[PDB]
Amino acid sequence: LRPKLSEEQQRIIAILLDAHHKTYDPTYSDFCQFRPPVRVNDGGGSVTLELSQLSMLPHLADLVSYSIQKVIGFAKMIPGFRDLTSEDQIVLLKSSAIEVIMLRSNESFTMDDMSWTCGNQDYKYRVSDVTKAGHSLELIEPLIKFQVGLKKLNLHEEEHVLLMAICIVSPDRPGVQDAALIEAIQDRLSNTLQTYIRCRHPPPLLYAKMIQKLADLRSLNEEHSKQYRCLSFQPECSMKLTPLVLEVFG
Numbered sequence: 001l002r003p004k005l006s007e008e009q010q011r012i013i014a015i016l017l018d019a020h021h022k023t024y025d026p027t028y029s030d031f032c033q034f035r036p037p038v039r040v041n042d043g044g045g046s047v048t049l050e051l052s053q054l055s056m057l058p059h060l061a062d063l064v065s066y067s068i069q070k071v072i073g074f075a076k077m078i079p080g081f082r083d084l085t086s087e088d089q090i091v092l093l094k095s096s097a098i099e100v101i102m103l104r105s106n107e108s109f110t111m112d113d114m115s116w117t118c119g120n121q122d123y124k125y126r127v128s129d130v131t132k133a134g135h136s137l138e139l140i141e142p143l144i145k146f147q148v149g150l151k152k153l154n155l156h157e158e159e160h161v162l163l164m165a166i167c168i169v170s171p172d173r174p175g176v177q178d179a180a181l182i183e184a185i186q187d188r189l190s191n192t193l194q195t196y197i198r199c200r201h202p203p204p205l206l207y208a209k210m211i212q213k214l215a216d217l218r219s220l221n222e223e224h225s226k227q228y229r230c231l232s233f234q235p236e237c238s239m240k241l242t243p244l245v246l247e248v249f250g
């Protein structure tokens with residue numbers, strides 16, 4: 001049974017594609033405005049040295065902070081999001097920010113060399129850059145596995161934006177008040193995605209795979225939170241972050 005997308009579902013897709021195009025610059029032209037990337041000698045991947053310098057933290061914190069601002073803008077355009085109270089909106093944004101960043105970054109991720117390529121060598125981010133920002137393999141390895149698995153689903157941009165929207169409007173986040181309204185908004189998005197898939201996605205299970213990526217994201221979120229807490233213990237770490245990053249992860 002392949003019901004056609006309703007006029008409403010078509011509108012939801014057009015709105016999400018527009019929101020993404022307005023909030024994700026595929027040329028990465030703003031990145032030179034961030035504090036500059038610095039890459040120190042760390043072939044040994046020394047934790048002591050990485051924590052002592054946190055060379056790539058200013059740049060990656062600025063990239064993440066910028067990305068959170070973009071995610072806030074994207075979320076505000078999701079059909080139904082503005083119906084939620086501001087408190088619920090903020091709870092959802094703070095809890096999903098890192099997950100949406102991991103999802104949206106798949107657009108710059110490339111399997112050519114397993115990096116997030118955003119321009120010249122200066123803005124090519126590799127695993128070694130994340131270690132230079134103070135993170136460990138317990139987060140990085142699973143993150144790369146997630147990027148590759150997501151890349152291989154070969155999602156249509158419609159599916160990609162719907163997945164980000166579904167990730168943000170999740171009723172099971174701790175602290176949510178009106179879970180039922182959030183579930184209604186999410187269900188409207190989920191049905192749109194399921195309909196789109198069994199309608200526009202050429203053969204050769206995709207929906208279940210996408211749902212599984214949302215579960216993987218919860219695991220990555222938890223590991224990232226654990227590592228952020230540890231990083232926050234490093235003296236002077238707050239200056240290398242930004243007020244928005246401090247609030248969202250603090």
Ligand SMILES: C=C1/C(=C\C=C2/CCC[C@]3(C)[C@@H]([C@@H](C)OCCCC(O)(CC)CC)CC[C@@H]23)C[C@@H](O)C[C@@H]1O
Binds near residue numbers: 067106
């Ligand atoms: C962001 C975006 C991009 C890349 C994402 C990356 C590469 C760098 C390392 C990141 C940011 C990972 C992250 C695990 O690295 C640094 C973690 C950052 C922090 O915990 C808080 C700032 C301090 C160490 C998650 C996603 C990774 C570029 C572009 O696709 C826009 C997108 O919007």
